[PDB]
Design a binder for these strands. Structure first.
Lengths: 54, 251, 61, 49, 164
RNA sequence: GGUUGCGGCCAUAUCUACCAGAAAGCACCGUUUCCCGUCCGAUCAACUGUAGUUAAGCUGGUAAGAGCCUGACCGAGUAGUGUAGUGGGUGACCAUACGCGAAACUCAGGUGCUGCAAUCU
RNA sequence: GAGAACAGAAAUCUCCAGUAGAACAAAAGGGUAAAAGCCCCCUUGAUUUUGAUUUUCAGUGUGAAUACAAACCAUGAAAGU
RNA sequence: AAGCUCGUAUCAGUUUUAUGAGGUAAAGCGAAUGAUUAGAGGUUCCGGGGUCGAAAUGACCUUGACCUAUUCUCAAACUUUAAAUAUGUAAGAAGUCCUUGUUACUUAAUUGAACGUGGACAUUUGAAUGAAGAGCUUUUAGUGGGCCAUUUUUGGUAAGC
């Protein structure tokens, strides 16, 4: 029927790795009230860095 | 009670055994990094306590506090616990806490805490509510529990709500004992007759009292008596002290 | 529903790494800011003038 | 132990490396102790190895 | 720390609801001057002729100076003589009477004759510490009344012999 | 230092029993016209701090008290447990080697500490 | 446990002790003491639009559940829920 | 198997330091909870079904509602206490610190929150050891009857069950 004999050894052939933890995590799933402002925050801070700082 | 019984039950909280605080009400008030301000109105015999208190895990922080006993600075010396002195007290912190922030910028808002006073309309508790709302604090409320509210319809009487502000129920009651039973009337209201302040003159005292509170909220403290330490040295006499080990071993 | 200690202990150890490095920049000296494991102890002269070592003789039973 | 034996570079039978002794590496030898034999070498064997 | 009467409870137990319950309800109503509150039964026994929540009995409480004239005009029926025991260890006492025409009433063939329980509770001033809401407390040992303190109080005023 | 309002950790703060508390603060207490709430102005509501008390509450002290909290080359390197042997025993199990290591108990001392604001010989 | 005419093992009434020894539609285990239990007061959030996520898992479906956003309402003096 | 982007990257069937999680073995019964073989009578303290019934003062039969007053012995489906082995995360560049930039979110408030410009901080850049490259992507083959030993265990007296 059921057993787990020789299952740990099959997992450690190609190893057990991490999800490799990117910069800039996906904002899908965050509270939308934070997402709706954070759009308009970046749209301004790219303007003043292009207009003023040059 | 068995020795197993005292080992088993856990105590309530310290502020819960001494039954001053409901925590079921408190856990709704506190948890709303923004400091969340709360108006605390308590009533003893012969005093009124009104405090603006924020929430901190170190335990609390008080911004502004005014009491009943600061009112004889402002012209109210008799009836410090009625509905009107409750109204002038809520007008008092509302001027006082608003000055130190520089407001008197949407409104400033403060939530009302009560404690264990039961919710009945015409209470003296909501006098400090109406005094705070007129003072300028954004205290969210409804006109259900103000006095002059009909149980039949959804009507509030502004002619009678104005009456309790200037002590109408006291000034009318001075008239009902004027013609009936002087022996009662000399017994109560004795500070009124010794200063010879009758019923109709009471309203003008309150009217002048609201004008001074809006003028002078800056709370100079009582200067003091002797010192800090002189009050501490005299207090060391009446208390006892602990007992050493060998004195209880010789006993 | 928790909060963690061990990370907040690391956040205090970074502050120690700032002040040691800022001090050693002033007075010219080595930093040695990496941790080390336990080390085998050194040689120490031990004087049995106070207490004579007593024999044991594992008899009892 | 087989992971610990690979960390000391001790792959084949009759092989040897020098190990610095701390609290950390003393616990590694404490795992693989039924497989290895170790002691404190003199200057003579280090010169001859 | 005097020994004032707290209240006076006037109980009437009738095993049936209906007219006899309501006609007994008028008796306390015209005597105490107040509306008597009714009482529903907890559970059912069927030997007593009861059922669950049947409004089995009425009673009324009187507080203050009105209760003492009700008590004295009631206690006169027992001729200023209670029995031996009759006293709680807390400090309270009660007694029941037949024939409520002994406190006097017209015969009233509609209403009829009923038997009442009188019961008295005693406390000192400072009993508000248990009954209040903020900062509830317990009564101290020396201020908790006794069975004995009721005996000397009941012997002193009303001039009675306690008995036995 | 004493009290008061709002709390933080939530018995070293509890439980039982007696005894003290200067001042002020709280509390008991007084009355029912009005808002108000009840079988009952008891609870709650409003009114005066005037008619009276520290008797309770509350705070503090006391007891080889019960409970409760830390501590111990105390129990004890004991029980148990990871690893190793072509070790012992017919076994049931027990030594040994490299390591980790309790608890009940016994004894020792302890019996709330503190945050903000206001106020008192 | 101590008391109250008829009235007792069992009605009703009154105080003291009372860490859950009760109750919460039902199995069992959790949870709960100014409540999540009891009794009153008002009510339909047992609603609309679709997404994000957890457990069973192929990280498919179905069931059940969690935290939000935009709307409209309920209740409370209010924070909230 | 075909390879592709790159080249000490950053990782690991491992240990240390730090810090969580658990209710097993051992402990406990004079701390809460505590079965078991067993059982005499108690007719509106009930009746739980059943059959009857031109009815209900309504019969007939069987578990009983109750242990009524007791006694000894417990544990995987009992617990205050709590190992060993096993197990989650952290040990810095995507970092710390300063100055101040944005927005329709937030605050009583340009206070916060998020992401930034500019400036300071270098190989001991933040524990040990190791790294016979690291990383990602396609594509398909076989397989989907297993068995044995050490130790812990459940059903079974027992077993190459």
């Amino acid at each position: 029927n059921h057993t787990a004999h020789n299952q740990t050894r099959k997992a450690h052939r190609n190893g057990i790795k991490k999800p490799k933890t990117y910069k800039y995590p996906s904002l899908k799933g965050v509270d939308p009230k934070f997402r709706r402002n954070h759009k308009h925050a970046l749209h301004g801070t790219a303007k003043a860095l292009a207009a003023a700082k040059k | 009670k068995s020795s197993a019984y005292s080992s088993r039950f856990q105590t309530p909280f310290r502020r819960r055994r001494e039954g001053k605080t409901d925590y079921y009400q408190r856990k709704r008030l506190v948890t709303q990094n923004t400091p969340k301000y709360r108006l605390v109105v308590r009533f003893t015999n012969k005093d009124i306590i009104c405090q603006i208190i924020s929430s901190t895990i170190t335990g609390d922080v008080v911004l502004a506090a005014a009491y009943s006993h600061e009112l004889p600075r402002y012209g109210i010396t008799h009836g410090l616990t009625n509905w009107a002195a409750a109204y002038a007290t809520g007008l008092l912190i509302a001027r006082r806490t608003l000055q130190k922030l520089g407001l008197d910028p949407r409104p400033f808002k403060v939530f009302l805490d009560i404690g264990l006073q039961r919710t009945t309309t015409g209470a003296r508790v909501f006098g400090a509510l109406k005094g705070a709302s007129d003072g300028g604090l954004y205290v969210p409320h409804s006109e259900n529990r103000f006095p002059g509210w009909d149980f039949e319809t959804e009507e509030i009487d502004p002619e009678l709500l104005r009456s309790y502000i200037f002590g109408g129920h006291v000034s009318q009651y001075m008239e009902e004992l004027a013609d009936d039973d002087e022996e009662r009337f000399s017994e109560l209201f004795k500070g009124y007759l010794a200063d010879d302040i009758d019923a109709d003159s009471l309203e003008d005292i309150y009217t002048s009292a609201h004008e001074a509170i809006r003028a002078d909220p800056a709370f100079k403290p009582t200067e003091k008596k002797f010192t800090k330490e002189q009050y501490a040295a005299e207090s060391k006499k009446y208390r006892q002290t602990k007992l050493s080990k060998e004195e209880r071993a010789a006993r | 529903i928790k909060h963690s200690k061990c990370r907040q202990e690391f956040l205090e150890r970074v502050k120690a790494n700032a002040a040691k490095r800022a001090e050693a920049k002033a007075q010219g000296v080595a930093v040695q800011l990496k941790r080390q494991p336990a080390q085998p102890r050194e040689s120490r002269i031990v004087s049995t003038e106070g207490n004579v070592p007593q024999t044991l003789a594992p008899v009892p039973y | 132990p087989r992971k610990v034996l690979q960390l000391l570079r001790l792959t084949r039978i009759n092989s040897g490396t020098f190990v610095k002794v701390t609290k950390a590496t003393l616990e590694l030898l404490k795992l693989i102790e039924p497989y290895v034999a170790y002691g404190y070498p003199s200057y003579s064997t280090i010169r001859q190895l | 720390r005097d020994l004032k009467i707290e209240k006076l409870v006037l109980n009437i137990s009738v095993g049936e609801s209906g007219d006899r319950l309501t006609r007994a309800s008028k008796v306390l109503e015209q005597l105490s001057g107040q509306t008597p509150v009714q009482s529903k039964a907890r559970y059912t026994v069927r030997t007593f002729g009861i059922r669950r929540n049947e409004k089995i009995a009425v009673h009324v409480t009187v507080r203050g100076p009105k209760a003492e004239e009700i008590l004295e005009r009631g206690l006169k029926v027992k001729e200023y003589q209670l029995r031996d025991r009759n006293f709680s260890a807390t400090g309270n006492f009660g007694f029941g009477i037949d024939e409520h025409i002994d406190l006097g009433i017209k015969y009233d063939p509609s209403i009829g004759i009923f038997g009442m329980d009188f019961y008295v509770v005693m406390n000192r001033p400072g009993a508000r510490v248990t009954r209040r809401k903020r900062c509830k407390g317990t009564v101290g040992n020396s201020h908790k009344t006794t069975k004995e303190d009721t005996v000397s109080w009941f012997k002193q005023k009303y001039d009675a012999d306690v008995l036995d």
